[PDB]
Ligand binder design. Structure first.
Ligand code: CLA
Ligand code: CLA
Ligand code: CLA
Ligand code: CLA
Ligand code: CLA
Ligand code: CLA
Ligand code: CLA
Ligand code: CLA
Ligand SMILES: CC1=C(/C=C/C(C)=C/C=C/C(C)=C/C=C/C=C(C)/C=C/C=C(C)/C=C/C2=C(C)CCCC2(C)C)C(C)(C)CCC1
Ligand SMILES: CC1=C(/C=C/C(C)=C/C=C/C(C)=C/C=C/C=C(C)/C=C/C=C(C)/C=C/C2=C(C)CCCC2(C)C)C(C)(C)CCC1
Ligand code: SF4
Ligand code: SF4
Ligand SMILES: [Ca+2]
Ligand SMILES: [Ca+2]
Lengths: 74, 45, 31, 66, 222, 80, 74, 42, 139, 66, 156, 74, 156
């Protein structure tokens, strides 16, 4: 379910953003799954609090990092 | 005192309290004994 | 048009009825 | 035991010398040490060229000086 | 030689800290408790389903109460595409001024949470239009969760505990769970959709004081 | 307070008794072996649970078991 | 009506001598399911983890709710 | 704004219920929940 | 009871704790024909005396790990006691005077099942009963 | 260094302000400095983009045995 | 030199210059937890007052209210109320729950409070101790501008 | 390795032609299998003895509109 | 059901769901007046603090000084000083005068304080209890404008 819901999300994040030819050309190899889905879409997430401010994703930028701590402590 | 001060800064930066965290702008923790050895090794040349 | 100030206090005393009945069940199940 | 220790250090020192003769041989035949010694700023240090098979000659990037 | 756990006496004489944790992850395994027969087994399955249904009905009454009180279901229902729902409000007393401002979103006058559950879209479809129908649906689910905590207390009293022949009545339970639990309650939901949710999707307001007079069809009941 | 049962597939090779670190097992006389012995566990209150008697039994699907049960202060090895 | 205890042990199919339902021996399965509270629990979680996948596979493709297709996060 | 306000009805009620159930009441609750965990039988 | 001189040990840290004063405490007692040095089960090394030795240990696995060490010093006469805090010294190893490896008579087949191990009953035979499946009085 | 004397560093004084939160290590170090190994396909740094992803395999593969 | 603990080589401690000095034995056995001839209320009253006094410290200069002056000393007192209520809660909870048949062992030093009437008297001391000290360090901090003057002769 | 070594055209790309047949057997006319509710001259499209597919013209407007998640392009 | 009081039909009480419940018996017998294993000082210190805390209440908002703010909290504290001095006067006066040969009967529950050394210790508890509570609710009321801010995030 980290392969089901990673593929539901990236197929739909390419339709909602209009870039349907992003999923259709770079999901056939594992770099585009890592470059165009994980690395690209986490840009607006980890900037939930930069040194210059704080927006409405400041709790999702914190829970995203609370969940790396809970995974690593496992 | 090293990792949970990175979780104090991580919570103050998310709260919008950049004056409450262990910064050079907030609560300063200066390396007093290691800034002094940088002063010794340039005054003995 | 949100609910009134009294309707919050009405909900707090109605939910003492499943708050006390939750205590009658949790002790009849013999903790 | 100690004769096995002493004789296994010699076979180890004969393994470092194989690797140390592979760093000097690759600087001898497969490097740009001539072009790097003339200009150690513009020319990038490189040894270990790659064979033309499987399309992996894309790893042979430009190191300055052809 | 402690009292906790009272269900297993091989763990109450534990001299270590294993007693606390192994009494948590064994407390619902009723089949391994000391001094339990099969008839007393099923009567605690049955009366803890009642205390579990009340958790579901108190949880669903915390969805409804917190969007009637702190949500914008009156505001969202007029432009349901260009405004975000509100889950509840924030009271974290250690916010800075940069997090009061950042979380004061969706046209609120206080910090709030944008509801990503989709219950606003569910109640717009089934015919809920005001913050009062959400409130009297939240007060009803509180009282509905009270008749299930009372029923669970009822079926542990010795005049009301069912016997093992009633729990092992598999053919009579399949008759009523298909016809009554799945059939009638799906017949009843088609009753809500025809009477309330379809006419309220067409403009007219059908409520409790209104549904017995106006029929849902001009060729109605015949 | 574990439970060390002993089954009749024993051969009396005394290997579980030499491997026990707490003296739970001991050899009693019997009739169904060439050694004439079988193990018995009279000091099962001293069973530390470590199943070292089980690694020493040479009979296939071994003739001695330790059933880890209600653990106590001397069945968990606590010197504090 | 039907007696489930009879449907397990029925070994007669219009004069033939089949071993049970689908020529397979299902005898003694009534008192296996009915006494086991874990057979009844495993069949009820398998039939609820299919209805929970079927919820997910259908509610994105055939949305039942008003303007939930145009709310990309919920 | 610079303060936690509430536009909703009874906005004084999170002002006391959030300190109550989160740092005022649980240490009483963890005391009562400790006095039956470590209670002896006779 | 028990008596003997303690070995030359310069104190340790892995020794007795508050359990040994309050619950139970063990004591091994051997005699040595030599002034030799042995390894302590509580970490370190001690010199045993030439008379009756006496060493207080905290649990029974420390005594028989020490008893298995003295048997390599050809000392096979050790007695292990168990000292309750009221002073009651029981004598537990070896119980009959004979070591449990070699067989003696009068001893009992205690905790013995008269079946193969593979023919223990199923756990659905013992459902809602007090016994476990390895107690099982049939065969 | 330019033709005046000021120095423009590679990330630019980034350690002083953002290396005190470990969201800053995640955003300003691991995310922002791996833009050269992520976008290293079709180029001469192509093997580093494969060893980056072949490395993540062996870590997750290690957790089968651990 | 380090000899075994009170002459017993079998006990699990050492008679080391830190625990068995002349100095550090006469300092530890004269702290109020170990001083001879004290009622358990006077033990707890002296233990508490040394703790309420410093616990208002780390919140009035590096707390969330340090930018102000009158509200800084409130948040440092409110801290030491909550640290010392929830600690004196935990030792009434301790004595209720450990004195039920095992009075720290009926059968011994470093814990000389083994009675449950010597612990319920202790809990009354640490409460009134750690809040006399929390107020004395509160009245010496909200009156600091008036105490800088009388310790510098500025009041003539 | 093929995209990394320059030659993205040397990828092995299996077109999933069995689940592209499912959408073309339900009404998706994008691929062009032209059978069985993609072929309007078929027995399943018309339902020749009764012609009571009153659900069908509304369904094919949904599956062939490219703005919903109903049977996405595969 | 209502049975006779502890099995005695001749005693003048009933074993009713209010006095002989499982809940209301475990709540009353755990209040500090009845809790098992408490010294009488710690009984009175907990009884008093719960009483000094609320008794400053009804005079700072409906008293004669309610129109002001700084003088309102003084008249509420001065009330709870006088309520709790004259109540802790009345129980030193009680123990002097009832313990003279009849210690609440030498021959019994609901009044477990029958010694006169268990009552003189109680009077020291209710005095220091009901004036720690009267000051804690005084310091939380004269600092209310500074406590509205830290419970609303107004101090950043
Ligand atoms: C008509 C009479 C009737 C009704 C309404 C019920 C109702 C109920 N019983 Mg009862 N029961 C009955 C008669 C009845 N029973 C009789 C006669 C017996 C004697 C044998 C029992 C013995 C019994 C026991 C032992 C227990 C119950 C329990 C329950 C509760 C189930 C908990 C739940 O949430 O369900 C589900 C709620 C829903 C809204 C169902 C929706 C979710 C399902 C999974 C999806 C439905 C979709 C459908 C299946 C899809 C496929 C359709 C198909 C055509 C394609 C429920 C309220 C349990 C309980 O006590 O709970 C308190 C339980 O322990 N019953
Ligand atoms: C006990 C754990 C501990 C450890 C392993 C370290 C380790 C280190 N500290 Mg340090 N420190 C500590 C506690 C500790 N500290 C405490 C409690 C304080 C507050 C007084 C400090 C205040 C401090 C300062 C101001 C500095 C260090 C620095 C350093 C580093 C250089 C070594 C040094 O001698 O500096 C000094 C060691 C001490 C002052 C020891 C403190 C007293 C101990 C408990 C005895 C080093 C990695 C220096 C550094 O390199 O910063 C980058 C630096 O200048 N520390
Ligand atoms: C550390 C030890 C070491 C390592 C890792 C290598 C590795 C390599 N050598 Mg080298 N070599 C070494 C020692 C080493 N050599 C020594 C000691 C000598 C002297 C005898 C050589 C002489 C040598 C020659 C002549 C060639 C290589 C070549 C190669 C490359 C491919 C060889 C193959 O297909 O297999 C490879 C990168 C080949 C190459 O680089 O292709 C262009 C090639 O032509 N090597
Ligand atoms: C398709 C699978 C495949 C095969 C059969 C080869 C085969 C080879 N590679 Mg290669 N390689 C591959 C994939 C493959 N590679 C991939 C995916 C990468 C990127 C990580 C590389 C990067 C690489 C480098 C940098 C080099 C080789 C080299 C070699 C040659 C000698 C290897 C050796 O010494 O030991 C050999 C013919 C060496 C060579 O060319 O010798 C001169 C060498 O320098 N490979
Ligand atoms: C010291 C760290 C800390 C602590 C103790 C809390 C504590 C709390 N937060 Mg919180 N939060 C934090 C950091 C913290 N937060 C950070 C760094 C952010 C991002 C700015 C948030 C954003 C946040 C939101 C959006 C909400 C909370 C809420 C809450 C309350 C709910 C309890 C809970 O969910 O668990 C609780 C009082 C919730 C609340 O107010 O409950 C009604 C609420 O919805 N917090
Ligand atoms: C179990 C579900 C359920 C329930 C409780 C009802 C109840 C009712 N229906 Mg309804 N109905 C239902 C399902 C249900 N219906 C379904 C599934 C359909 C679709 C076929 C209808 C279509 C329907 C029509 C067309 C009418 C009713 C009417 C009525 C009302 C009868 C009038 C009266 O006074 O007595 C009554 C309250 C009649 C009415 O006049 O409402 C006041 C009416 O005309 N119903
Ligand atoms: C179970 C559903 C549910 C959930 C998840 C919540 C959640 C929340 N409520 Mg609550 N609430 C509920 C039901 C629920 N409520 C109901 C039915 C009422 C009407 C009486 C209320 C009235 C209420 C008020 C007045 C306030 C909240 C507030 C809050 C927020 C913080 C908690 C708090 O301090 O207040 C404490 C909670 C209560 C006083 C009542 C909750 C108890 C309900 C009735 C049942 C929950 C118990 C549950 C079944 C236990 C099972 C779980 C367990 C097994 C682990 C939090 C988001 C605060 C807020 O608005 O934040 C900004 C606030 O002050 N709620
Ligand atoms: C990157 C992480 C990773 C990978 C690749 C695998 C891979 C595998 N797991 Mg898994 N697993 C993991 C993490 C991982 N696991 C973790 C964290 C857990 C939790 C403890 C599990 C627990 C687990 C269980 C319980 C089982 C597996 C099984 C398997 C095998 C699945 C069958 C198959 O052929 O697939 C693909 C084959 C491969 C990926 C092998 C790679 C081929 C190599 C690279 C050839 C080249 C070798 C050369 C030296 C280079 C497969 C080897 C199952 C199994 O063994 O099936 C019988 C099995 O039952 N795993
Ligand atoms: C180890 C050591 C050390 C240290 C010490 C320390 C750590 C310190 C400290 C200290 C402290 C920490 C002190 C304290 C204190 C205190 C006090 C002095 C108190 C008080 C008080 C009071 C007086 C109170 C009062 C009151 C009351 C009773 C109530 C009412 C109110 C009032 C407030 C009035 C050194 C190195 C130096 C040396 C020696 C040894
Ligand atoms: C019956 C009941 C109830 C009721 C209850 C009540 C009636 C209440 C209350 C309450 C209260 C009424 C509480 C209180 C409190 C308190 C406190 C918490 C205190 C305190 C204090 C302090 C802390 C002090 C301090 C001090 C001192 C010691 C001296 C010096 C100064 C100072 C101030 C620092 C209900 C229904 C709810 C439920 C349950 C049962
Ligand atoms: S259990 Fe092992 S050692 Fe004991 S008699 Fe059987 S085979 Fe021999
Ligand atoms: S569990 Fe350990 S002590 Fe017990 S019989 Fe087996 S080896 Fe001996
Ligand atoms: Ca601040
Ligand atoms: Ca007046």
């Amino acid at each position: 379910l980290g392969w089901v819901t990673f593929y539901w999300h990236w197929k739909h994040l390419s339709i909602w953003q209009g870039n349907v030819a992003q999923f259709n050309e770079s999901s056939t190899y594992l770099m585009g799954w890592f470059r165009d889905y994980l690395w690209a879409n986490s840009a607006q997430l980890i900037n939930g609090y930069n040194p210059y401010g704080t927006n409405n994703l400041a709790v999702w930028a914190w829970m995203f990092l609370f969940g790396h701590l809970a995974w690593a402590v496992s | 005192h090293s990792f949970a001060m990175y979780c104090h800064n991580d919570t103050m930066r998310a709260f919008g309290r950049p004056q409450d965290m262990f910064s050079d702008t907030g609560i300063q923790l200066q390396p007093v004994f290691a800034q002094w050895l940088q002063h010794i090794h340039t005054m003995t040349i | 048009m949100s609910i009134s100030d009294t309707q919050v206090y009405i909900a707090l005393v109605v939910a003492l009825v499943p708050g006390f009945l939750a205590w009658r069940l949790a002790t009849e199940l013999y903790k | 035991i100690s004769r096995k220790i002493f004789a296994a250090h010699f076979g180890h020192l004969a393994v470092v010398f194989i690797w140390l003769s592979g760093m000097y041989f690759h600087g001898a035949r497969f490097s740009n040490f001539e072009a790097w010694m003339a200009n150690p700023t513009g020319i990038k240090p490189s040894a270990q060229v790659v064979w033309p098979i499987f399309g992996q000659e894309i790893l042979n990037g430009d190191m300055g000086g052809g | 030689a402690t009292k906790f756990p009272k269900f297993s006496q091989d763990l109450a004489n534990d001299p270590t800290t294993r007693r606390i944790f192994y009494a948590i992850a064994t407390a619902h395994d009723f089949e391994s408790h000391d001094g339990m027969t099969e008839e007393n087994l099923y009567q605690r399955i049955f009366a803890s389903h009642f205390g579990h249904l009340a958790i579901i009905f108190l949880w669903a009454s915390g969805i409804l109460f917190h969007v009637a009180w702190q949500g914008n279901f009156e505001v969202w229902i007029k432009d349901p595409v260009h405004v975000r729902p509100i889950a509840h409000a924030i009271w974290d007393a250690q916010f800075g001024p940069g997090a009061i401002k950042a979380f004061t979103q969706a046209g609120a006058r206080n910090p709030v949470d944008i509801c990503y559950s989709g219950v606003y879209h569910w109640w717009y479809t089934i015919g809920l239009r005001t913050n009062t129908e959400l409130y009297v649906g939240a007060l009803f689910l509180i009282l509905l969760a009270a008749v299930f905590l009372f029923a669970g207390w009822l079926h542990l009293q010795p005049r009301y505990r069912p016997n093992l022949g009633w729990f092992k009545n598999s053919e009579a339970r399949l008759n009523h769970h298909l016809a009554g639990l799945f059939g009638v309650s799906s017949l009843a939901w088609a009753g809500h959709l025809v009477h309330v949710a379809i006419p309220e999707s067409r403009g007219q307001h059908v409520g409790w004081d209104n549904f017995l007079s106006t029929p849902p069809h001009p060729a109605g009941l015949w | 307070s574990h439970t060390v049962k002993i089954y009749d597939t024993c051969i009396g090779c005394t290997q579980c008794v030499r491997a026990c670190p707490t003296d739970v097992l001991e050899m009693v006389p019997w009739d169904g072996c060439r050694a004439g012995q079988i193990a018995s566990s009279p000091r099962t209150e001293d069973c530390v649970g470590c199943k070292r008697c089980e690694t020493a039994c040479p009979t296939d699907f071994l003739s001695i078991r330790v059933y880890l049960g209600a653990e106590t202060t001397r069945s968990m090895g606590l010197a504090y | 009506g039907h007696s489930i205890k009879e449907m397990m042990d029925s070994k007669t199919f219009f004069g033939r001598k089949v071993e049970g339902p689908f020529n397979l021996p299902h005898q003694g399965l009534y008192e296996t399911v009915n006494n086991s509270l874990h057979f009844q629990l495993s069949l009820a979680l398998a039939c609820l983890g299919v209805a929970s996948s079927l919820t997910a596979q259908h509610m994105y493709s055939m949305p039942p709710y008003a303007f939930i297709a145009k709310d990309f996060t919920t | 704004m610079t303060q936690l306000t509430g536009d909703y009805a009874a906005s004084w009620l999170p002002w006391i219920m959030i300190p109550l159930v989160f740092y005022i009441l649980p240490f009483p609750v963890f005391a009562i929940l400790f006095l039956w965990i470590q209670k002896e039988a006779s | 009871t028990l008596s003997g001189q303690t070995p030359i040990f310069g104190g340790s840290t892995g020794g007795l704790l508050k359990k040994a004063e309050v619950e139970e405490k063990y004591a091994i007692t051997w005699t040595s024909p030599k002034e030799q040095v042995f390894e302590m089960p509580t970490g370190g090394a001690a010199i045993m005396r030439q008379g009756q030795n006496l060493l207080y240990l905290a649990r029974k696995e420390q005594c028989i790990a020490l008893g298995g060490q003295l048997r390599k010093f050809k000392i096979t006469d050790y007695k292990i006691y168990r000292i309750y805090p009221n002073g009651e010294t029981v004598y537990i190893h070896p119980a009959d005077g004979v070591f449990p490896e070699k067989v003696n008579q009068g001893r009992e087949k205690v905790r013995y099942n008269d079946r193969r191990i593979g023919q223990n009953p199923s756990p659905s035979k013992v459902k809602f009963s007090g016994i476990a499946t390895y107690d099982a009085p049939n065969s | 260094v330019g033709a005046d004397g000021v120095v423009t560093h590679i990330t630019g004084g980034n350690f002083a302000t953002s290396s005190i939160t470990n969201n800053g290590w995640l955003r300003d170090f691991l995310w922002a400095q791996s833009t050269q190994v992520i976008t290293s396909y079709n180029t001469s740094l192509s093997a580093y983009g494969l060893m980056f992803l072949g490395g993540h395999f062996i870590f997750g593969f290690s957790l089968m045995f651990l | 030199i380090i000899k075994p603990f009170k002459g017993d080589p079998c006990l699990g401690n050492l008679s080391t210059p830190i625990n068995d000095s002349p100095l550090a034995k006469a300092f530890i056995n004269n702290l109020p937890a170990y001083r001879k001839g004290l009622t358990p209320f006077m033990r707890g009253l002296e233990i508490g007052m040394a703790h309420g006094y410093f616990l208002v410290g780390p919140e009035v200069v590096i707390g969330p209210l340090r930018e102000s002056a009158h509200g800084a000393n409130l948040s440092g007192l409110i801290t030491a109320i909550y640290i010392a209520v929830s600690a004196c809660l935990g030792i009434s909870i301790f004595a209720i729950t450990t004195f039920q048949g095992n009075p720290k062992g009926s059968y011994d030093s470093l814990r000389p409070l083994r009675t449950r009437e010597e612990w319920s008297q202790l809990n009354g001391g640490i409460f009134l101790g750690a809040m006399g000290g929390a107020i004395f360090a509160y009245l010496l901090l909200e009156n600091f501008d008036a105490l800088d003057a009388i310790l510098r002769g500025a009041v003539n | 390795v093929e995209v990394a070594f320059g030659a993205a055209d040397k990828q092995i790309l299996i077109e999933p032609v069995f689940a592209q047949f499912i959408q073309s057997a339900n009404g998706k006319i994008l691929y062009g299998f032209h059978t069985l509710l993609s072929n309007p001259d078929s027995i399943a499209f018309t339902a020749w003895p009764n012609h009571a597919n009153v659900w069908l013209p509304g369904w094919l407007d949904a599956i062939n509109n490219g703005t919903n998640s109903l049977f996405l392009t595969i």
